[PDB]
Structure formats: C-alpha cells, structure tokens
Design a binder for this molecule. Structure first.
Ligand SMILES: Oc1c(-n2ccnn2)cnn1-c1cc(N2CCOCC2)ncn1
Ligand SMILES: [Cl-]
Ligand SMILES: [Cl-]
Ligand SMILES: [Cl-]
Ligand SMILES: [Mn+2]
Length: 204
C-alpha cells in the first residue's frame, strides 16, 4: 500500500483497536541493508593501538539512509493526522540507534513513558538481515493492559513496529545469542509534552 492507504486502512484502526501495529517489508531489502551498513559503521568502529546507544538526527554524514527511514516513519505518522486516539502528534525524538549484545541478556519488563513525559507512540525498525528469532532470540513480548492475551513480536528484517508508549504496553525483550540492531523513535503528543516541559528553567 502507499503511505496514505497504509496509514488510514491499517495503522490507524490497528492502533485504536490493539495499541500494537506491525508493518512488514517497510523499506525493502536494498534500503534495509544500506541502513544496516550505516548502523554498523556507527557502532562497529575499531580500536587504536549493557548496550550501545547513539541518537541520530538524520543529516549526519554517513547517516543519510537512517534519515530516509525517519522521513518514511514521519510520512506514515503525518497521514494518521489526528486519528491516533486523541493525540496531536507535533514532533518526535531523534532516532535511537541501538546495538544489543548477543550475550544471553534480556531486557526487564518496563513501560516507555510511565509518568506523562510526552511520548505517545513508540516506533521500532529492525534491520538485522535474515534474523531467525527461533534460533537467535531477541523476541519482544508486549502485555497490553487488561487484555487476556500478550503478543510476541519477532525482530524481523525490515519490520516496523508501532505501539502506545504509555502504561498500556509494558514490554520485555528475551535474550539473544547474536549481535542485533534496532532503531527506535518516539512521537510526542503536543499537550502532554508541553505540560511535561513547564517544570524546566528554559532547559527543555
Ligand atoms: O532498548 C529497548 C528495547 N529493546 C532491547 C532490545 N531490543 N529492543 C525495548 N525497549 N527498549 C527501550 C529502551 C529505552 N532507552 C534506552 C536507554 O536510553 C534511554 C531510553 N527506553 C525505552 N525502551
Ligand atoms: Cl512494567
Ligand atoms: Cl528503560
Ligand atoms: Cl519536545
Ligand atoms: Mn521499551
């Protein structure tokens, strides 16, 4: 589907019904591999003589295709104009470009935004080519609040994931046995983000 059709026919009704939406084959193989090359360049540096996080705006040298990813995410969110709950999405974070070690470590269950920090939608893009979660792990488990079911989401290559960032979606990540990368972006609700910012002295 084109971005308009995908947003209105799939992403919007999926998010309002479930709070979780998976889009597969988001950018295609060639672009996905290019993003992987850029991400590995950021994190796979050598040496002279937890996890790794970098925050990317999208116009840094060697990050142009990460920027294309962010523009593509922005395109989908824009076409959701005012249809994602009651939110008015007026901005987002930088891209969190993460490298997660394959050392048998998982991520404890948590809520991204538990206390009204302004973030209403979490977007995650998975860029590890030919990742087989059945063999290598790394599955995301989301527990939508009050539902009888929970969801396991495999970090499949070129997969885009949306979910509500607030207490509706506690989530945990199972351990993995190879290095993997994911890029996360959070979209802000205008009113909540404004309220969260009033406490600061001109300091964001
Ligand atoms: O890194 C992840 C994963 N994950 C792990 C492996 N695969 N996916 C799932 N949530 N999550 C995360 C990270 C985060 N940070 C990271 C440290 O800086 C501050 C903000 N804030 C909220 N959620
Ligand atoms: Cl939790
Ligand atoms: Cl966290
Ligand atoms: Cl902000
Ligand atoms: Mn999280």
């Amino acid at each position: 589907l084109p971005a308009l059709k995908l947003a209105l026919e799939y992403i919007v009704p999926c998010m309002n019904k479930h709070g979780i939406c998976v889009v597969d084959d988001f950018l295609g193989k060639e672009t996905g591999q290019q993003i992987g090359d850029e991400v590995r360049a950021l994190h796979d540096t050598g040496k002279f003589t937890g996890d790794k996080i970098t925050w990317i705006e999208g116009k840094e040298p060697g990050c142009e295709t990460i920027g294309l990813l962010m523009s593509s995410m922005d395109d989908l969110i824009r076409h959701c104009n005012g249809k994602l709950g009651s939110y008015k999405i007026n901005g987002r974070t930088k891209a969190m470009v993460a490298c997660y070690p394959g050392n048998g470590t998982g991520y404890v269950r948590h809520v991204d935004n538990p206390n009204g920090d302004g973030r209403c939608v979490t977007c995650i893009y998975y860029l590890n080519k030919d990742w087989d979660a059945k063999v290598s792990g790394g599955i995301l488990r989301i527990f939508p609040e009050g539902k009888a079911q929970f969801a396991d989401i495999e970090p499949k290559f070129d997969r885009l994931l949306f979910f509500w960032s607030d207490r509706r979606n506690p989530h945990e990540v199972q351990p993995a046995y190879a290095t993997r990368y994911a890029i996360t972006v959070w979209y802000f609700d205008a009113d909540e983000r404004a309220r969260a910012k009033v406490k600061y002295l001109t300091g964001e």
